[model samples]
Target chain A: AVIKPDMKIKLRMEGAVNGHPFAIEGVGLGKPFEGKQSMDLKVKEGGPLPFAYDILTTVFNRVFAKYPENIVDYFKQSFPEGYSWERSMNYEDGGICNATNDITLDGDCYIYEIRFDGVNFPANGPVMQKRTVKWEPSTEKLYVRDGVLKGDVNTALSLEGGGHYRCDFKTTYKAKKVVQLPDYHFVDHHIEIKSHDKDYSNVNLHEHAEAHSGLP
Target chain B: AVIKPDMKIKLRMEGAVNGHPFAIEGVGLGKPFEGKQSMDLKVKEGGPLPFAYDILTTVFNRVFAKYPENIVDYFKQSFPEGYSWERSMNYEDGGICNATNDITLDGDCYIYEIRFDGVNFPANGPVMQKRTVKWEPSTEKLYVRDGVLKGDVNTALSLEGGGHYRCDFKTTYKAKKVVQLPDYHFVDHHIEIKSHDKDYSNVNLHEHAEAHSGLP
Candidate 1:
């Protein structure tokens, strides 16, 4: 979307974790995206979204107990030069998850890449499984314009041990026309989740985004 | 140090930020020093010396208004792969401070590089100043042995623009062996800050380390 100065956006997300149902929502604020300027964006669980929390806590408790704060907080500061989130879980077995959300500022439009690497029991064991999610925008255009975001971002979730899942959906972000504030604002838009899998057949899922203002 | 399994070490630090002198300290619970098996370490400004807080707050208020929970909290999570602390400041005219503490695990021992990119507005208009700090372990062996840390890890600080400052001291970390713990412990050894600048001149600053236990 063409995020004009002082514009805010919010987004909501509804989907599954490893086929387990759950929903998530968050907000993002905008700014000059320059030196020392701070921006605020938050993602929170929604509803019995209890499953999402379980996935987060289960991995941390099983591995990252020493740093029991919020996983999001860690991800927020995971990278210094660019933007990235990487965490390794060590327990009876080992697992690793790395997500990279890179935002490229091209004039009025904002382009980003959201990818995830999920591996469980990866200590060179038999139970080891892997799932990779990435934004495939080359075939489908992904960009923001005029306070609205439009794109058909395709995400592929494949399991090395068993079945693979494919999701092709149009990601939309609607911006509010309220008077622009000096600080960064967020937006909440909807997303459709269409998947083809045997283990968990067909299920309806949607995603949203909420944008909030932060230091910049 | 080898940081053997269940080996615990404690560290304490006493130093000054800007012209405001203070003492900051914390403990480190050790692990494989690999992925996100995060260990907790705190650096708090001791009483008697409260100016450091003022220096930290001044820049954040002017530059980072949105994410003002605790500058320390943000720095605490800046690095998850290994260990690091990073924070940027903003001011009226302009200001910035980038500090990185990179800890490298070399099999039987550990090597750490402490560097800082300190810059500020010169008393004269538009002219900015710069200062850099780093560790030199070649001359004075920087390593730990028999649960004890011994080294004169030399650190150098030089400024650009006008007169700069420098510090040279022995970094000592004494491992306490009350009994072995299930995690890594840390200590804050002593450091000397020496400067020959037009602004802040030579000052006697020494830091020490103390070990303690925390969650495994």
Candidate 2:
């Protein structure tokens, strides 16, 4: 009799933007998140059988970075490759960090960073800075937070001092995805970037007009 | 014996921001843009037809409208559930039209009359202002001639006009998805709103911040 003791370790995801807490916990199921929340944990089965599960989160991050090609290949295999996308703000050696002090694509989740370069905004006080913020894989839900043009980019940078623009949103997503890959090397470490072909002239002419136009 | 003569069509994707032209094209081996270039297309009996099938040019406009879900889906499936994509503008709703002055979605494709609102700028004086514009669906490629933005909202109103901006991108995607076959429903068209849950609240905070900061 292979006695399998039921040991469940609840996990939660929490992060902060400008020091505002946001968290979500799952006890075998993924749950939605809401306003600011903080970290709190509970344990069962005699305080977690003296071991380490820290690798779980670390492995997940590694999984996301490595198998970018596999996921991309799956997307191409599943859908028509007619659209375009850019992995902007990527670090010098890749893996998310960017030239801008703004850290984007950091590990996982939360991809709201835009190409806010000079070409993306005007010199006006109130302007709409649009960035293509979205997620991976393709589905019909169209989970998007569009028409987001409210906050400000204070010229006076402040690690702690920044304006607060409060808004409320309902949270609800009940789904679990367990990606078990027989080939971890390909899906968890190696990444390949395909090249984009250009058939037109040397310069992307439209970019010229938008040069002075303040927007994203 | 059955014989389907070889035919040719074009696939062109074009976009502009502020007032620049960003375009890409490719020729397919099958009935225009309907088939994928990655697959091999060879006639069984016939060596080669008198007329060869080719996809001359296809813009990204059509691609954007029909595949917004694909972009969103890609983000959810990733381990961290958030990602920035180099999404093509053509996938956003039937792209804006310079010839017609109406908007419509024709079965996953947006169809419009281009004659109503044609391009209205100097040979290159910032393709911004347009009195009448419409949207139409095309079985061919995409071509955007005006406005820094790809959709209508961004077109008629450039950055200077108000809050408008545009960009073009391309990339591979990996999506994690959750399907819910709700046990209740009547009108399929009735949009299902965001559900309230912990996960929902979590994503909302950062996303909301992005919006508030005019960084959408």
Candidate 3:
């Protein structure tokens, strides 16, 4: 309910999917609705396999639209005295799959303690419901809006290293804004989604047909 | 003096070189010193010209490093209730060069009213001295550091059309922090640098040699 319509915005969005770290940093115009604040942020740098980037970027945008959180505020509040992160010795530069080993992050990160829970639709639409939503990274062009709806987040992702992973919509209303923001810091974000979310612990999968050709 | 060592941050920076609107939006690690804070921000999007971008990016980074104005803070303070700027129908998409005509920008931008003056180096070295700086917007490779020093900004830029425009050093210490921010809203950023700065009005150029083989 706070996002302005065409205001400029900067995002230092980084997070872990499964366990692999993905970051999308850059600025974009704000796309805010009643209580939903969504931004079609263009990626300046950072990646996680083109496919994963597509998935995450869209998912992140759509999820944020459901619940508004001032991402910029979170960033400023986290680093009141600039940054003091040390570069990791074990960290390798020239990252793969588009990800760069920019620096070892050691401070507050996410602004939300997301938990879709049983709220299928939080505000307007069902936050989480049976296969009602359609999560397609990008059907055709670049920066174009993807298909989205109020339903379960059911899809299969082509993993980073190799193999196919299914996101059987389990918890739909999960991207809840964090109340007690964690006092956590990140040194490195190594992607091994399989290693972190074993059996998709914090995932939201569909009730049937574990995997679907998401948006053929 | 409130930027973390490696804290993540978001920046929605935009301003007029002469009068042409230029923007550098995205996130990057904080590079802060005693009273000077800066960040080697990545350009997720936004552009003037390839050369303009190079000039502005380096100039912006170096300038910020000297002054240390929290760019993210300025962005947050602007769009507290999101944004309300309307996109101008006059704006033509498919931005020339590398810039994108994303949307009409409206709100708070720069964090300081810059003024480097005879102070050469503000904190570490001289703030604004005689031509002691070398601004070669990427001498060879991309993202590489352009030649910079602790002196005046004397350089020549190949204009948008097909001519060389020299930036002779004038008022060196001009990037001072602002005293009061204006209620600004921009619809389009057509960079007619010449039109805006009649005879290089507010530019900081050199006293002699209107132009030189900048970094060649």
Candidate with the greatest DockQ versus the true structure: 2
TM-score of chain B of each: 0.25, 0.19, 0.27
Q: Model 3, stretches more than 4 Å misplaced? A: A1-9, A15-22, A34-51, A59-134, A137-152, A155-166, A170-216, B1-216
Span of ten consecutive residues with least summed lDDT in model 2 chain A: A203-212
Task: List ranges where model 2 is wrong by over 4 Å.
Answer: A1-14, A17-19, A22-60, A64-216, B1-5, B10-29, B32-216
Instruction: Please give, for residues A65-94, the per-residue lDDT of candidate 2 as tens digits.
Output: 112332222111211111112212221111
State the displacement of the C-alpha of residue A78, model 2, in Å, after optimal TM-score superposition.
Answer: 30
Off by over 4 Å in 1: A1-109, A112-216, B1-109, B113-193, B196-206, B212-216
lDDT of each: 0.27, 0.19, 0.23
Q: DockQ: which is higher, 1 or 2?
A: 2
lDDT of 1 by residue, B32-92 (tens): 2211111222334434432222222111100011122321112112222223222222233
Cα shift from native, residue B187, model 1 (Å) = 5.3
Q: What share of the true interface contacts does each candidate keep?
A: 0.00, 0.00, 0.00
DockQ of the candidate models in sequence? 0.01, 0.03, 0.01
**CAPRI tier of model 1:** incorrect
